[PDB]
A paper describes a structure:
In this study, we describe the structure and function of a highly specific ion channel blocker from the salivary gland of X. cheopis, which belongs to the FS family and has been given the name FS50. The FS family of peptides is unique to fleas and has been identified from the salivary glands of the rat flea Xenopsylla cheopis (Rots) and the cat flea Ctenocephalides felis. FS proteins contain six to eight conserved cysteine residues forming three or four disulfide bonds and show relatively weak similarity to scorpion toxins. In this study we have shown that FS50, a salivary component of the rat flea, is a blocker of the sodium channel NaV1.5 that is capable of protecting rats and monkeys from barium chloride-induced arrhythmias.
FS50 contains a cysteine-stabilized core βαββ structure having a general similarity to that found in the scorpion β toxins. The protein also contains a second domain made up of a small βαβ structure that is connected to the core domain through a coil region. While a second domain (the NC-globule) found in scorpion β-toxins is made up of elements both N- and C-terminal to the core domain, the βαβ domain of FS50 is comprised only of a long N-terminal extension. The C-terminus is truncated after β-strand C of the core domain and does not contribute to the second domain. The core-domain of FS50 is composed of a five-turn α-helix (residues 37–52) packed against a three-stranded antiparallel β-sheet (residues 25–27, 55–59, and 72–75) and is stabilized by three disulfide bonds (Cys 44-Cys 72, Cys 48-Cys 74 and Cys 31-Cys 59). In the second domain, the α-helix and two-stranded antiparallel β-sheet are formed by residues 5–9, residues 1–3, and residues 17–21, respectively. A fourth disulfide bridge between Cys 7 and Cys 52 connects the two domains. Notably, the loop connecting β-strands 1 and 2 of the core domain is elongated and folded back over the core domain β-sheet. Along with the βαβ domain, this arrangement produces a somewhat flattened surface unlike the protruding C-terminal sequence seen in the scorpion toxins. From its structure, it would appear that the binding mode of FS50 is unlike that of the scorpion toxins, and outside of general similarities in their overall folds, the two types of proteins probably function differently.
Author numbering: 1 to 77
The structure:
């Protein structure tokens, strides 16, 4: 799975040419701030499908796979 800088850091190059392997893409910072968990979930899922071009995603929950609550973790198609 290749994703863009925009996917990973939130801004930058648009084309999907960053290799992340077989795991999730870390969309840094997409779940930061004071919005509700539901609203953050929507922002994250749409960043994942619309920018990372994955199937969906979810905010960090402290697990090994999704360790940072401020980050959004996107799954491939």
């Amino acid at each position: 799975w290749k994703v863009s800088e925009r996917c990973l850091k939130g801004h930058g190059k648009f084309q999907a040419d960053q290799e992340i392997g077989n795991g999730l893409a870390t969309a840094k910072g997409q779940c930061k701030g004071t919005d509700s968990d539901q609203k953050k979930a929507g922002k994250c899922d749409k960043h994942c499908t619309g920018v990372c071009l994955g199937s969906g995603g979810s905010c960090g929950d402290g697990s090994s796979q999704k360790p940072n609550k401020e980050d959004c973790y996107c799954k491939s198609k």
